[PDB]
Amino acid sequence: HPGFALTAVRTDTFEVDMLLYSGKSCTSVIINNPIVTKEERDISTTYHVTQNINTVDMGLGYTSNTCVAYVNRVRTDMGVRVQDLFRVFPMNVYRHDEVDRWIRHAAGVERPQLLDTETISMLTFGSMSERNAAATVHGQKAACELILTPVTMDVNYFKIPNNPRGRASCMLAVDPYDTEAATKAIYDHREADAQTFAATHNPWASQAGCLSDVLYNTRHRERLGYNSKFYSPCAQYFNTEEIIAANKTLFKTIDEYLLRAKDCIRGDTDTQYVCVEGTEQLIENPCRLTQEALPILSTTTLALMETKLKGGAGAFATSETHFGNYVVGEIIPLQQSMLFNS
């Protein structure tokens, strides 16, 4: 055991069927007759027909609601395969060349791959350096960790859903259009963060200048050479400037939540690649709006996992602790429900 504890984090997708409710005639739709544009090929001709649609909301408040109600397939794998950090920083090597060669031989990655110019990234949109594996039976996967202290008190911090950085970063609490008070809320350690009444829970993740602030802030990732095409689960938490720019009033917050706060991931490959101009899918993210992660079932010994799994229904909601071993329990019975509907 080295002298730290790694807190891992991941974004796991689910294919769900959400229902929607509307009142009588919520939006008046304005349609016209379709217009045909003609184009001529060598043997055939292509007619592009086009109908314009205007939508006028006939409501003061929200005349339509929705709710995610049922899940049927889990597109990810719920796996623990670690994010390949060498595939996202393909330029950074160690200074002495032989110890760098020994490190690459000690790990799985092999070579520092040269990045492209501005012209190649202008023409060719994506890199996707890591290739599709042979057997993709479980599905796509991701896991990225934070080197945090082993002192970190889990019962306050790991059993309930929290921000994984150590400080609460939901901008609903801060006054809107107040960047100074927001930065004082998420960076200052002369005051307590509002979730847990201490200065922080982990100084290696909370304040600006830590390892997380230079590893996952995409503003700070611009300083070094990085690949943007991979996905970071930490990207929805340490992106400080977008969080400050998200500090609006709550109606506008709801607007940008259900309009712009929905991620996009390519569903074909096992690595979580960041999609672009994705009209084929959109991954809506409530955890971005909470700015908080979800506790998952974890344990220390195989015997304690055995007495959890062998035990009756509802055991995963509990969370017991041995002398040096412990179980944190998932707050919603998602394993229970997702296996029980099967």
């Binding site: 597109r75 993709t136 479980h138 796509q140 074909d268 490959t269 096992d270 099967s342």
Partner: peptide
């Protein structure tokens, strides 16, 4: 039949992975 998976459509690795997951689950379950 739980998902629109007619033979003219193509599949990626995530598709066949979740299809095999439900294959094993419903082979054992019933």
């Amino acid at each position: 039949v739980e998902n629109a998976t007619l033979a003219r459509q193509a599949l990626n690795r995530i598709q066949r992975s979740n299809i095999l997951q439900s294959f094993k689950a419903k082979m054992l379950a019933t």
